[PDB]
Amino acid sequence: DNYDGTEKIPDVMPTKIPNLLVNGSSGIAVGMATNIPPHNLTEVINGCL
DNA sequence: TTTTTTTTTTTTTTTTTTTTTTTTTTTTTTTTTTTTTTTTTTTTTTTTTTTTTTTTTTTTTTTTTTTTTTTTTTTTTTTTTTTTTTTTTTTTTTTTTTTTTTTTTTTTTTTTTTTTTT
């Protein structure tokens, strides 16, 4: 449920694409900090297979 | 195949101008110091009956020096003109209202790289 409690939000998307490796990410947390480069979708799917 | 003319951007560094850091003078601003106002009470001042011996005004008459007085000639007063100040129509500029068009900034958090100082 959302902040008001009047509507629902997904906890996680049911992805088919490996979005983390594919599109990458970059963010600055208080203690941690992530920096993940993008990747090619065909190569990542071959690795998954 | 060798040799000859011309064209411009650079070795440029110096003159002129512009931009950017500076600090004397009249207009603000916080402080201390002197003018205003309200209570207590307090000896002290001040309002009001009675008696009293006083000292200045009103019977009457006197004069003299200020009140009569006329007249010459000044000189303040009034007239016109022009300048200086005051005051009010006129104009200009700016601000606010509510729907529109556009934009612009300050910080956390981590991790890695430049970019100065020691």
- Residues 6 or more apart whose CB falls under 8 angstroms from that of A21 comprise A36, A38, A39, A44
For strands A33-36 and A25-28, give the pairing.
Answer: antiparallel
Identify the bridge partners of residue A44 per DSSP, sorted by sequence position: none
Instruction: Give the Å distances, CA to CA, from A5 to A31, A35, A39.
Output: 30, 33, 38
Experimental approach was cryo-EM
Instruction: Give the Å distances, CA to CA, from A29 to A6, A11, A15, A24, A34.
Output: 29, 20, 24, 16, 8
Q: Closest by alpha carbon to A34, among A24, A44, A42? A: A24
Output the distance from A49 CA to B53 C1' rounded to whole Å. 151
Return the number of other C-beta atoms located less than 10 Å from residue A21's C-beta. Answer: 18
- Residues 6 or more apart whose CB falls under 8 angstroms from that of A32 comprise none
Q: Find and list the nucleotides of strand B having atoms within 7 Å of a protein beta carbon.
A: 109-111
With tokens 């990542």, the residue in question is A44
Q: What is the resolution of this structure in A?
A: 3.0
Cβ of residue A49 lies below 7 Å from strand B: no
Q: How far apart are CA A1 and CA A10, in angstroms?
A: 9
Cβ of residue A28 lies below 7 Å from strand B: yes
